[PDB]
Amino acid sequence: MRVFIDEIARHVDQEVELRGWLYQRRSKGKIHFLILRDGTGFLQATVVQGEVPEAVFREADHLPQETALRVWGRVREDRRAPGGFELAVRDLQVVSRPQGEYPIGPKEHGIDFLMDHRHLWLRHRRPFAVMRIRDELERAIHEFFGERGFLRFDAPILTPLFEVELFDGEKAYLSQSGQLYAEAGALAFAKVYTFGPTFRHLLEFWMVEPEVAFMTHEENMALQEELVSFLVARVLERRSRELEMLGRDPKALEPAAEGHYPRLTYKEAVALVNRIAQEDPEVPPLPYGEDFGAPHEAALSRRFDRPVFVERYPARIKAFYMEPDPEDPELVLNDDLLAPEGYGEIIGGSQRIHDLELLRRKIQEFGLPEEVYDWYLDLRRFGSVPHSGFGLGLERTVAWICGLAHVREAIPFPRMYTRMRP
Amino acid sequence: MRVFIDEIARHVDQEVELRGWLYQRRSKGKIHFLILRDGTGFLQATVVQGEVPEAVFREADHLPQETALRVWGRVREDRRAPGGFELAVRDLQVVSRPQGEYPIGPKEHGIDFLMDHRHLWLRHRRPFAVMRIRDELERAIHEFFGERGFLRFDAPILTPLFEVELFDGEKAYLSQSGQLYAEAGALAFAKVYTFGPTFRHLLEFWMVEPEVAFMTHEENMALQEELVSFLVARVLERRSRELEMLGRDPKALEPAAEGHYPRLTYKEAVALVNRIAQEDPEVPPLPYGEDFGAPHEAALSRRFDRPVFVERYPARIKAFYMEPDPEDPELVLNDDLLAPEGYGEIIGGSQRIHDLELLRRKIQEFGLPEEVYDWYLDLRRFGSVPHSGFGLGLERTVAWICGLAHVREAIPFPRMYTRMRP
């Protein structure tokens, strides 16, 4: 029967069929060792001279990389085989051969060449591992919020920023965040999350944005920690093979899986960064009141062994909708979660204003057109409750978990100001 | 302890707390009957004069619609209560009152007024039911493909159609479909699906687009049937309450849940439509070679009790990438799945060309710029295998399952050429 490499362990000592591609090939003495990929994994297939028809042995001599292939054989358990299993091949059929030379030979090229060939490069071991971890995270996000009674709530992408021309003279704008709509959602369904593209490194990325009715700042941070540690735990448990293919040290991820994330106020974070900047030539000072520069963010991130929260920034550098700190008028009740190892911010969140007049005056103080926000103001006129939410950047989270050098590797086909292709 | 209405059955005869909103209110004799919503459901709460402090009874006299509320009481099982349960209230605390008159009183307004107030209207019973069914479908899609070893594969939205201005003079275009990228995905991961927004009724909608390596036309239709019948079954099993709130007859959905969907060739469909058009004044004739007009689609859809497949259309009215019918050169191996009851197309799919030169000449015959499709052509140069896929429109599927009058009701904040707000 036809099976997939991913399920090969369930078929030990049976005759099966694989359909896929020649990933690698080597020979020693009377054995050809093929590495086959079928899209769900990589598996050694042996072709043994004298134990298969000579035509089959010779045909298996004759296979360039990315030859498409059907192979038939017996599943063998064998710890000398990478994976722990191999296919003892009995028959083999070429489905197609490359028209030209395949552009990506093993262990050769630099990362940019590989990303220019992204549509082919996705087939290889490292992008395979990254994408399977990405899939694992997206599924696990839906399970995490589904099991807690959250409703997925798709925020609009077109908004009345990148500008889009509509029919006639009309113009719309690509969403940078579904949060405002998610708040309407939270007031209708108690607990919701968007899971969609937003547009601002990457021009285009994916954001999970939960909003919860009656939820406070502190509960908001607790929810963030709960989610991130669950996701790291889930990758550790189910994608340990992919982590291994990436050369990712699980020990760098285990603290995140256990929670108890350290927290810092903005003031404390600034003081810390400026202590670091004195003993360290490669970290510049940080004047109070400014947002964290890239080196500052990195220095904070590398200080801890798991994600670190930074909360209660100055109002002056945050958004109009954020709830003011009740014991400190210059600050708002917000938080950013920083991944360790220099990966930096993976979550941005806050408690939102629930008082009608406060929100009116904030909409003015921030010099905003009140009319366009009237519906948003309705959320305070009718059934207003304290509520909070946040947005998790999927690509930065993937990049961190996988240990990638750049976020563009975390998404199948990245869009950046420079590369917009394929 | 604080609980949600959705979990109320697990807490019979316990003292609990609810946090939510006054949805409706009526009184008879010494009982105030509140209908509370907390975002996860609707629940009767009784306040009994003489058994609660007089202040509490009087406070509960005093509650306009969308008053935000905390209520404490004992969960009672009671079939006279709608839901089968009610809260016997002991204490109650107003969290907030409406600033102004709430614009949506029960059983009053026309659909357009309600959609103009969509951000508030989402709180009510019918949109509640629709959105919970939508959530059920999105979760179930991830489970269906996750359990079959499909990988979620996010296709880019920005493409090199709606036009978007980038920095400098550069321009991109909102994706109308992730299929081309999904094919690269299928060749890398065997079986994939996009789950994302596309842009073309609705300007913006959600598409699940599976692609499978080595999969044929016939298997493609089998996969489509399997998926749709699973989704209908899943809504029937887990959202029967929401279906009931919608007044949706489960009997209209049960045939879809069982599969065995009828199939028609394009030629057969045309002949059928034209037979229908003779006995029926409200169905116009259909010349051979034309795509199905709206009345034709509707007449086909209303002919059957479950979704119907239409396959093997003329090449001349389909896309460049579609595999030609091997026994009939004028036709391609494609299919559209039509929902019954006049809802029409919910899936469009086909087998794709895997032969390199055939695809080159099709790219020319269709007058297309070969350069921009070179990467796509690489998918035929290297590791080319027969493959197929399709796209399921989420909103049309929701609209059909819920029995809605228009697809705009199937998405939280619809974008149409006319309404772009909120």
mmCIF file with all atom_site columns, C-alpha atoms in Angstrom, chain A residues 9 17 61 70 73 96 104 108 114 144 158 163-164 207 230 234 274 279 283 310-311 368 378 401 414 419:
data_model
loop_
_atom_site.group_PDB
_atom_site.id
_atom_site.type_symbol
_atom_site.label_atom_id
_atom_site.label_alt_id
_atom_site.label_comp_id
_atom_site.label_asym_id
_atom_site.label_entity_id
_atom_site.label_seq_id
_atom_site.pdbx_PDB_ins_code
_atom_site.Cartn_x
_atom_site.Cartn_y
_atom_site.Cartn_z
_atom_site.occupancy
_atom_site.B_iso_or_equiv
_atom_site.pdbx_formal_charge
_atom_site.auth_seq_id
_atom_site.auth_comp_id
_atom_site.auth_asym_id
_atom_site.auth_atom_id
_atom_site.pdbx_PDB_model_num
ATOM 1  C CA . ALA A 1 9   ? 7.069   3.425  11.698  1.00 0.00 ? 9   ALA A CA 1
ATOM 2  C CA . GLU A 1 17  ? 4.968   2.065  -1.952  1.00 0.00 ? 17  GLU A CA 1
ATOM 3  C CA . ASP A 1 61  ? 22.571  4.265  -10.433 1.00 0.00 ? 61  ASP A CA 1
ATOM 4  C CA . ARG A 1 70  ? 7.802   5.659  -7.237  1.00 0.00 ? 70  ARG A CA 1
ATOM 5  C CA . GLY A 1 73  ? 9.953   -2.232 -0.937  1.00 0.00 ? 73  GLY A CA 1
ATOM 6  C CA . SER A 1 96  ? 10.102  12.331 -14.244 1.00 0.00 ? 96  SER A CA 1
ATOM 7  C CA . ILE A 1 104 ? 20.581  23.616 -5.483  1.00 0.00 ? 104 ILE A CA 1
ATOM 8  C CA . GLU A 1 108 ? 26.861  24.658 -1.389  1.00 0.00 ? 108 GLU A CA 1
ATOM 9  C CA . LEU A 1 114 ? 18.754  29.955 -1.752  1.00 0.00 ? 114 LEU A CA 1
ATOM 10 C CA . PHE A 1 144 ? -5.083  26.516 22.548  1.00 0.00 ? 144 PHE A CA 1
ATOM 11 C CA . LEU A 1 158 ? -9.155  46.444 3.757   1.00 0.00 ? 158 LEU A CA 1
ATOM 12 C CA . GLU A 1 163 ? -2.861  52.424 -0.094  1.00 0.00 ? 163 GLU A CA 1
ATOM 13 C CA . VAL A 1 164 ? -5.077  50.399 -2.415  1.00 0.00 ? 164 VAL A CA 1
ATOM 14 C CA . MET A 1 207 ? -0.579  38.102 13.559  1.00 0.00 ? 207 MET A CA 1
ATOM 15 C CA . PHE A 1 230 ? 2.426   26.235 25.702  1.00 0.00 ? 230 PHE A CA 1
ATOM 16 C CA . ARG A 1 234 ? 4.293   21.835 22.010  1.00 0.00 ? 234 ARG A CA 1
ATOM 17 C CA . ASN A 1 274 ? 21.857  51.812 31.066  1.00 0.00 ? 274 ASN A CA 1
ATOM 18 C CA . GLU A 1 279 ? 30.151  47.778 31.309  1.00 0.00 ? 279 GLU A CA 1
ATOM 19 C CA . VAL A 1 283 ? 25.561  48.721 23.966  1.00 0.00 ? 283 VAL A CA 1
ATOM 20 C CA . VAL A 1 310 ? 8.402   45.050 29.710  1.00 0.00 ? 310 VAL A CA 1
ATOM 21 C CA . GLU A 1 311 ? 5.335   46.923 30.947  1.00 0.00 ? 311 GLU A CA 1
ATOM 22 C CA . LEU A 1 368 ? -7.265  62.076 15.243  1.00 0.00 ? 368 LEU A CA 1
ATOM 23 C CA . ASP A 1 378 ? -19.855 53.093 20.300  1.00 0.00 ? 378 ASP A CA 1
ATOM 24 C CA . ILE A 1 401 ? 11.983  28.886 18.100  1.00 0.00 ? 401 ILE A CA 1
ATOM 25 C CA . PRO A 1 414 ? 8.540   36.651 2.176   1.00 0.00 ? 414 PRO A CA 1
ATOM 26 C CA . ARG A 1 419 ? 12.576  41.098 -2.593  1.00 0.00 ? 419 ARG A CA 1
#
